[PDB]
Design a protein around this ligand. Structure first.
Ligand SMILES: O=C(Cc1cn2ccccc2n1)Nc1ccccc1
Length: 330
């Protein structure tokens, strides 16, 4: 089997992407944030604290003839932006772009943090990291991908995120019309539960490539590109007037600037992030100070190849027995 779904930026900045997901019988369609940085499928629901819901579409398991409460099971998660949620668990039928999993753990939120409430466009998360990170207790649950894996034509999914435009998530096949050149594959460590790999280096604009090992994760649930401070400093030094602002909480730059590109290495291959992809707009409405899309990972404890990096590529998440990651230009 296969599936294919369009993923759509939630706003003009591409702060995140949403993908429609069918849950239950008859289908209830919710727009979820596909997150290769986490391993829980969770939704706003009829169980969510009333005051914590503001515009989201909710899953109502009582209206689904295939929902079953997973007895005694609970879940609780936190993300890198400091947001969190928690609740109980149902099993139900979940379909993504024509690919159906029966018996999928659907984590029903009872509680969500303010950032989730405040974003009306995201109806929950669909985690695509390794199931070892799944938070359900006392019986850990598998991800959608893990459950669909053996049924897929090939045990893979691909992320093709657009810049200020819709993209695609495919399951079980690689669309060879969706990228240019070849896909370069690279080793993955699953020891922290993430799609963790090692970039071979970087370049700033038309500058010389610096060969250096940069360990980090491929994370569709993180908007920006978080890299070591040395790297980030080298980038922003090429932007007149750019500065790290402790008050704003990262590098800012004059909105009048034209930003240089940023290149990252994948083995001997190179992925080029255009300058405009690194512009995240005014720090506040009407401001002429803009927020940068490359930021320091100092203090995170891990480097993160977020949407700013992944959207410049066609990315293969190869869930073979030994997982790997593939990157192609497009
Ligand atoms: O936390 C993540 C993945 C992530 C961040 N998110 C923010 C909002 C909504 C979804 C979401 N997913 N990645 C990460 C961050 C820090 C350290 C390790 C992994």
């Amino acid at each position: 089997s296969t599936g294919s779904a369009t993923t759509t930026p939630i706003d003009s900045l591409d702060d995140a992407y949403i993908t429609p997901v069918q849950i239950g019988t008859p289908a209830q369609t919710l727009n979820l944030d596909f997150d290769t940085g986490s391993s829980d499928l969770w939704v706003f629901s009829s169980e969510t604290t009333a005051s914590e819901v503001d515009g989201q579409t909710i899953y109502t398991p009582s209206k689904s003839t295939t929902a079953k409460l997973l007895s005694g099971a609970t879940w609780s998660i936190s993300y890198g932006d400091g947001s969190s949620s928690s609740g109980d668990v149902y099993t139900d039928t979940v379909s993504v772009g024509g690919l159906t999993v029966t018996g999928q753990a659907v984590e029903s939120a009872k509680k969500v943090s303010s950032s989730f409430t405040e974003d009306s466009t995201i109806d929950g998360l669909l985690g695509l990291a390794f199931s070892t990170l799944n938070t359900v207790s006392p019986t850990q649950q598998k991800t959608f991908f893990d459950n669909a894996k053996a049924s897929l034509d090939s045990p893979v999914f691909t992320a093709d995120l657009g810049y200020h435009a819709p993209g695609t998530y495919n399951f079980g096949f690689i669309d060879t019309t969706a990228y240019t050149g070849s896909i370069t594959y690279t080793a993955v460590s699953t020891k922290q539960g993430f799609w963790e790999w090692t970039s071979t280096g970087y370049a700033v604009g038309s500058g010389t490539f610096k060969s250096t090992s940069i360990d980090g994760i491929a994370d569709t649930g993180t908007t920006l590109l978080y890299l070591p401070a040395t790297v980030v400093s080298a980038y922003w030094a090429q932007v007149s007037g750019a500065k790290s602002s402790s008050s704003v909480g990262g590098y800012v730059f004059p909105c009048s600037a034209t930003l240089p590109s940023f290149t990252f290495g994948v083995g001997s291959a190179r992925i080029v992030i255009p300058g405009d992809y690194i512009d995240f707009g005014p720090i506040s409405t009407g401001s002429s100070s803009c927020f940068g899309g490359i930021q320091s990972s100092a203090g995170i404890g891990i480097n993160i190849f977020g949407d700013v990096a992944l959207k410049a590529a066609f990315v293969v998440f190869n869930g073979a027995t030994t997982p790997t990651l593939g990157f192609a230009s497009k």
